[PDB]
Symmetry: D2
């Protein structure tokens, strides 16, 4: 009757996640001055180095040096003894205009409504009634565990916690008629960067007690639950200095933690015309609607695009057999109710607002507000 399922998350100071956060700092910063900015900024993190590579065409004036350093300040990386510091690190800027070849194909000369896609791609959307957030529990708890760490780090409670971390959660489920029901937490993993001077025992206790027991409902915990708390033993070297960091390299953490499917596309660093972002948020929007709106417990939604073309080439809706209504019918309800041309998406989900930096840690989905988490009512 039961199966296991694992998902991971990572903290704000994880080297990949830094880049993701920096690339959206850079995005917000343009959108703050030029709503119709075209942004494809990739960040790379390594010891002492933040580098920005990509394409930007904008009217905004932007101090990348300020934008990056504040981003790294907000993360907590603010002293050499933490293995990284916004004050004294290097920032390289290798940023150009958008390819004029791309410029003409995507966005020159057409109503903002009938804008062609920014690239080709495939994007997925998912939602499940296993949780309030309409997300898998495995990923929801993974995020919350890194969230709690951050809370405890910045409030003082564990001033030995450093910014870099990774959680991983495995849950024992059961199959209820195509839908899934979480039953117990089988294994939690936490590895978090720390100050030299604390011992291992002290950390593991604190993670079991202050983090996990605070975060996981005790109904999902029991005497058989395995804990792997600082499994390595030592994690004083962290962030960029431990491990090179790249934008778009935590795109399963950003979405559904192995559940449903992924199209390949990264989110951070990209304005609305990048359909890797706009369509992906739309597809979430749609899936969450279909569940909340009563048609299914669990749903998967594909879309695909061609560069230069506005409508999608394909739309697919898989409901796992959790729906009375057919597969051609949900397709028709989605079609009645959504306009998945990237230029109409942006109106509905307000995607010119510089709110992207909030998205670049703890998931782009299942989260407090954001426009795409707010389900539309369905007419059918």
């Amino acid at each position: 009757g039961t199966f296991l399922f694992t998902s991971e998350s990572v903290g704000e100071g994880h080297p990949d996640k830094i880049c993701d956060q920096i690339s959206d700092a850079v995005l917000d910063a343009h959108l703050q001055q030029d709503p119709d900015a075209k942004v494809a900024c990739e960040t790379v993190a390594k010891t002492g180095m933040i580098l920005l590579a990509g394409e930007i065409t904008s009217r905004a004036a932007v101090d990348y040096q300020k934008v990056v350093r504040e981003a790294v300040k907000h993360i907590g990386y603010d002293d050499s003894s933490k293995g990284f510091d916004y004050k004294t690190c290097n920032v390289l800027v290798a940023l150009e205009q958008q390819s004029g070849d791309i410029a003409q194909g995507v966005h020159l000369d057409r109503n903002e409504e009938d804008i062609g896609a920014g690239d080709q791609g495939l994007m997925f959307g998912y939602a499940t009634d296993e949780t309030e957030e309409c997300m898998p529990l495995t990923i929801v708890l993974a995020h919350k565990l890194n969230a709690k760490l951050a809370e405890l780090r910045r409030n003082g409670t564990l001033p030995w916690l450093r910014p870099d971390s990774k959680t991983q959660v495995t849950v024992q489920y059961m199959q209820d008629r195509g839908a899934v029901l979480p039953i117990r937490v089988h294994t939690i993993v936490i590895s978090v960067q720390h100050d030299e001077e604390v011992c291992l025992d002290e950390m593991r206790d604190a993670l079991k007690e202050k983090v996990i027991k605070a975060v996981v409902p005790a109904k999902y915990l029991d005497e058989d639950t395995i804990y792997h708390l600082q499994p390595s033993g030592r994690f004083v070297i962290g962030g960029p200095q431990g491990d090179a960091g790249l934008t778009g390299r935590k795109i399963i953490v950003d979405t559904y933690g192995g559940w449903g499917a992924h199209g390949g596309g990264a989110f951070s660093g990209k304005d609305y015309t990048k359909v890797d972002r706009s369509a992906a948020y739309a597809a979430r929007w749609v899936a969450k609607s279909l569940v909340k709106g009563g048609l299914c417990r669990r749903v998967l939604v594909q879309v695909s695009y061609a560069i230069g073309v506005s409508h999608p080439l394909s739309i697919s809706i898989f409901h796992y057999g959790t729906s009375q209504k057919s597969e051609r019918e949900l397709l028709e309800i989605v079609k009645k109710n959504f306009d998945l041309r990237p230029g109409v998406i942006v109106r509905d989900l307000d995607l010119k607002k510089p709110i992207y930096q909030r998205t670049a840690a703890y998931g782009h989905f299942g989260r407090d507000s954001f426009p795409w988490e707010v389900p539309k009512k369905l007419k059918y």
Copy 2:
């Protein structure tokens, strides 16, 4: 009865794929001198720039300058008028040792057999009987279409084709008792970098005729099949100069094109102890076996790991209802037949051999040899 499903691939000269190929050039190059090398090399591509960021502990002496430039030579990027050239570009090397903190947690002091994982993570494996390769058709054809382009570029037939390209394939399927049957190709997309001097008409004809009709079985093509051939119109600016490139940013192209699931982990740049690679190939190995070995038409396999721990924390097998035998039974057959500790995987799949550069374009799966595509016989 039918649903659509899209998948993309990209050529050898796609800026991401360059990095993936360069990161495995760097990996092979170490493994050629030091079989037990520890390698985490990330490449970044942008106009005139290749950069290497990461961690390497090895006894090998390596001329990164040679290793990269030959990699870029083999790709075809060998003149300024192509938008990139191995002779005259910049190569930056920001490479350090592996974190000693990681070193002690993973691999110091233990039989190579009982080596702990290199990191935490989740990894998926998939196989489907819809094709000979045991892969989805959508992704198989996407790869072949970029493959044909490369053939035609390097043999002279279309000496206007440049290295950068992207294909995308959408197939109309039908559900046969949990399994899937491809029926028709609904939409093909191809966008490929070209010389200034050729016109659009000439290219589109050549793609329809020389590439698609050569690659797609005519049984999957008809008068309703949509073609989007150079949808942008112009693609003279390509490779790194068009678009920044990062290692590990085509990890859905590298695997199953939206089918099954993905754990988040990138492949290129990593030796065997990186379970993002070793377990992922093992999970493919297992899924392909279960199908070829007669137990299922379509199967998905999760595994997860903890950094420092050798055994996996979880193993999951989903067969889509295409199997007579239960879900606890396939689990037991896999367990009887495989040892998913990363240090035993490496023996069975021969993963110290410097064959990784071959993997970094056209998929890591469904491909000619490679040890993980060769199914093990099952005892049960």
Copy 3:
């Protein structure tokens, strides 16, 4: 009676000189929008790479990417087969604000007239009546020889000449009562980058005939004059790809070719408040005046500064015994006639005008216009 004396120059495509030219491109570009810009931009050239490191506080908006690439376009480096190309190279921008610590010390809150120096330093000025330009012949001819190469390269006459070159000139002098008289050219050296396909003989002939005989008065040439024309034999690999390039590493080429003295300070990349530039041009201005104005045949002038202090700490005038009037008297004539506070210099020599890129090749002295080559009339 006679002594030898050598001086070198280098072309517009010499890797150091590229940087010097790029750093003044960046300077002019600010001064074009913000006359009171504060600029300390260092450029570094190597294969495929231009990098900008330094400090800039300005109101100007500047596309460094455009500014650099055009600079490299104007040089001639515009194809991969020339070993460097403005289109496809990498440009890294590591540029910050000016240190606020420096900002307060130098320039916040004081009449632009009584501005303190930008740094400490020593600067020299020299002039000699051996030539019309009031410069040493050795250096004048070195420059002209690289100048002729450039003329012949850009007009077609020798389309095998590439941008990188170096000349070197040695002249046999005689001592006339403290002053110097050029007598013969003892040795000329020329090494210039070329296309693969031309032979050595052809080049050497062309250099002897088209360059040297065009440039050197035949009165200074004879049958004993040594020529070293492509002394290496082969110079196909040139510019940044041959040799790393740094701003401020041809500061003896920029000035007097070993004659007189140098204070250590580089010129390119710096606005007026950098006294390494402003005082050095002033000291030239003064020396040229004293000679043209009849008081000496040959003169050397030191000045020094303290960071934050406006007046100079010292002024020295050495006339080589070529002056009727004493050493305390020339000091007094200079003092009567010049105001060497950097903020008064800038008014007199018009040093906010974006004319600096013209200075960054072929010398900052002995040249057509520029304000500092135009001697002031002296009252005494």
Copy 4:
């Protein structure tokens, strides 16, 4: 009767000087394993960044990461609150082989004795009997003042002193029959990086009392001597973070502080075949000999070279009228006694020994040992 003359020096933590020191760290490191290494390594320093650009052909295996970081560790830059730290900064390595075009011209196929020059150039040598070191006092004292700072910083006495500093010394001389006699110190300048928490008054006192009075003979100080001690007021931001740093940009500090002449060539980063170094040390060697050996009080010596040619194209000896013997005669004594072909120089001055890092701060001349400071006895 009297004239003023200024000279500057800078500390071990001055951003230029860092690069110079790093480039010789890299040189020594090769010479330690491969005596006949060919090295042209340029370093660039800026906030968080050390970059190495250049050409190296060697059999040595070198961990540039270790070599640089230790170099920066030895300097004192070892915490974020000092504005730079060897632990956490970025090190970029853009290092290639030597141009094969240069390789064939300079050093393939010829007795190590009759090796051609590594490049063209002009180099100067100087010596003066005004001091024991046979150097100008202005520069000797400038160096000692930065030397004392370093002593006091590393021993604890002023643990507020940071690595970055600059001194400047002006001395009132008199002309004794072509030679020079120091009379008084007219102006001393010191600006040194400090901790936030010390006040200005405290520093200025300490510099007057602990540094200057310790370093300058009281015979050269009096009540008229001007002091400019922290002239800016504030210097908390220092090293690379204050000011970009380049190798070879303190080449007047490295030599004679404005006295004599300079050929343009930098020293650090270069093995013996780079005549910018080998000939310059030889010319010092020669000048010091002529003075110590009794033929002159003050002497200047030019040499020049052609790339590929072993003998020098020119040799010049100016003795300022401080010698009984003529100008053609000293030429003949030098010629009798020295072999200025770069491959014979290296034997005599032992220039394959990895002692270069000691040279890269406080001057390459007037210093304790080094082979070129040890005068040869003259036969004449």
